[PDB]
């Protein structure tokens, strides 16, 4: 049959909140880090541990930001997060101007 929209989303929320493994596949993230670093200094080498630490910090920060975004969206009587939500959360945080 068909699951009504919004139920499988709750199932994934339950699934991913019980687990800790990283949600971004490694190699694209590593290539993105390498590209970003290249603009600061050339012919650079990275320890896999450094790259893993970068991924852990980035994913945790993104999860916290998504939590704040969901809270902001709920405050607007809304269920869907939209860019203004991220913007407001970042603004109140003080990272974005």
């Amino acid at each position: 049959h068909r699951y009504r929209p919004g139920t499988v989303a709750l199932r994934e929320i339950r699934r991913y909140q019980k687990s800790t493994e990283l949600l971004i596949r490694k190699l694209p993230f590593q290539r993105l880090v390498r590209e970003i670093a290249q603009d600061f200094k050339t012919d650079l080498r990275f320890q896999s541990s450094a790259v893993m630490a970068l991924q852990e910090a980035s994913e945790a920060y993104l999860v916290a930001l998504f939590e704040d975004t969901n809270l902001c969206a709920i405050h607007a009587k809304r269920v869907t997060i939209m860019p203004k939500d991220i913007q407001l959360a970042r603004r109140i945080r003080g990272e974005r101007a």
Binding site: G6, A9, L10, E12, I13, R15, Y16, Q17, L23, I24, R25, P28, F29, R31, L32, V33, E35, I36, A37, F40, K41, D43, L44, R45, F46, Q47, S49, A50, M52, A53, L54, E56, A57, S58, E59, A60, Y61, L62, V63, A64, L65, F66, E67, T69, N70, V79, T80, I81, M82, P83, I86, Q87, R90
Partner: protein, 78 residues
Amino acid sequence: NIQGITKPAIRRLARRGGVKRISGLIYEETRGVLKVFLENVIRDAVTYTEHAKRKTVTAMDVVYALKRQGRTLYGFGG
């Protein structure tokens, strides 16, 4: 390259963050925010590594970088 952070990966991250419904422009906004965060952290890490006169950016450089940004991380030789 930056697009390598797939739309579904962003959905998984949001799901772990407790989000149920996600907008289309979200994904691009998150790509931008992640770009900015990585830019800052990697800039500090490079600054450290350059000051170390090493061609290899090390994990301790990364840890010091997040410590500067008030985003302390554990599990990599704190």
